[PDB]
Structure formats: structure tokens, C-alpha cells
Amino acid sequence: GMTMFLHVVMMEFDDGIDAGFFRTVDEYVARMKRECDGLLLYHFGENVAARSQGYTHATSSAFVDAAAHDAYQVCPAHVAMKAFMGPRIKRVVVYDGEVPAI
Amino acid sequence: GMTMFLHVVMMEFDDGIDAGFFRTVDEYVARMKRECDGLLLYHFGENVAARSQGYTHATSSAFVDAAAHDAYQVCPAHVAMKAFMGPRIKRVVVYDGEVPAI
Ligand SMILES: [Cl-]
């Protein structure tokens, strides 16, 4: 298709998180492309920008379209990840939008 | 390559921006896409996320690798783009990261 839907979730976590937290997140990340439809990209990692503003990590994702991102809401890997990460997240900021493919 | 460098700049603009501001943005961006190398994606658009935190627009971009993003930072047409937009930007936050290629 000529476009895709980008969804980027920037996050600042509690200071208590450990390597274990990230190990479990990565396990949810792994389930995601297996389990959700229309997912082109799905990654969780460290923010290396200078002007990160305290947001140290992000989930970055691209879907074939906004409807695939809508369905991702009940993707069980995602419902589960959200429930897992939620209590440890201090702040988030999100960018969603349609962008050219590639 | 297996990975690409993602670069997302979220922005809120000043209340007093002029009527054709976004068209001028698009002009600088177009000139920049003509002149600067190693871009896999570059889009300036509206942020449609509910959790936008008031960051109404973003630039989203992907480069072949970190070196290509490094060359873009110093691309004269990119520098010009920043000189125009900077004074109209009220708030900015940035995500950079290496992510799986699409
Ligand atoms: Cl203006």
C-alpha cells in the first residue's frame, strides 16, 4: 500500500525497574508480530536522542493501516504487555499518524 | 540492512503562527528531501494520538543507519528547515533509535 500507520509510545518509567523488567517486555514484543495482524514493525528500545526530555525508552510500531492498529488493542500480547508495564510507567507521550510506506 | 535508524520529533507550535506556516514547512521539507541523502522515510504531519500531550504535529523519519542521520543533521537544507521552524516551536521532544528495517 502507499501508506502505513505509525505508532510511537515514548515512556519514562519508575526508578525501581530492573533488567528483568526489560526481559519480560521483550518477551511480549516477541509475541506481537506472531499474534497481531497487519503489523509491519514492532520494537521496544532505548531513546538515544539528546532532547528526550526524560523519556528513556519507546515502543515503535508500524501497521498496514489505522484499522490494524485499532485491532492491536485487543491483541492479547498487547493487552498483557500494557497490564504489565502500566504500574511501572510514570509518563508517556504518543505519536500516531499516517505516513508513506517504506 | 537489518535495521534502520528512526528519528521522531514531536512538536507543539506557538499560538501566533501565520496562515501559510505549514505550507512553508512543507516547502523546506520538500527542498530537504531533494538535497539530503540516505532518507528512507520523511514525513511532517498531524499527531492523531489521544495521548499526544499537546504535541500536535511530528516529523517522522528513517535513515539507513546512524551515519546517515549524522549526515542529515548537517545537511544545509535540513539546517535551513530548522532555522525557519525553530522560532515557531513552543515545545519539542525527540525519539531516536535503531529498529528493525521494514
Ligand atoms: Cl509564522
Instruction: Kindly report the CATH class assigned to A1-102.
Output: alpha beta
For A10, name the nearest residue in chain B, comparing CA atoms only. B95
Mutant choice from A95, A98, A102 vs B, greatest count of B C-beta within 10 A: A95
For B41, name the nearest residue in chain A, comparing CA atoms only. A102
Task: Select from B6, B52, B60 the Cβ nearest to the Cβ of A94.
Answer: B52
According to the entry, how was the structure determined? X-ray
Cα–Cα distance list, B92 to A15, B14, B21, B56, B89 (Å): 24, 12, 17, 10, 7
A45 touches chain B (CB under 8 A): yes
The three-state secondary structure class of B20 is coil
For B66, name the nearest residue in chain A, comparing CA atoms only. A48
What type of residue sits at position B93?
V
What does the block give as the cell for B75? 545537511
Chain centroid to CA B40: 13
- H helical segments located in B1-102: 21-35, 66-73, 76-85
The answer to whether residues B6 and B99 touch, using CB atoms and an 8 Å cutoff, is yes
Cα–Cα distance list, A70 to A37, A52, A96 (Å): 11, 27, 12
Closest CA to A7 of A60, A45, A75: A60
* Residue ranges of domains in chain B: 1-102
Chain centroid to CA A68: 14
- Å between B18 CA and nearest CA of chain A: 24
Closest CA to B61 of A100, A33, A9: A100
The answer to whether residues B47 and B55 touch, using CB atoms and an 8 Å cutoff, is yes
Chain centroid to CA B63: 12
- Å between A53 CA and nearest CA of chain B: 6
Separation of alpha carbons A60 and A93, rounded Å: 12
The answer to whether residues B3 and B98 touch, using CB atoms and an 8 Å cutoff, is yes
CB atoms within 10 A of CB B42: 20
Separation of alpha carbons B29 and B55, rounded Å: 19
Closest CA to B84 of B26, B6, B44, B9: B26
- Cα-to-centroid distance, B60 and ligand 1 (Å): 21
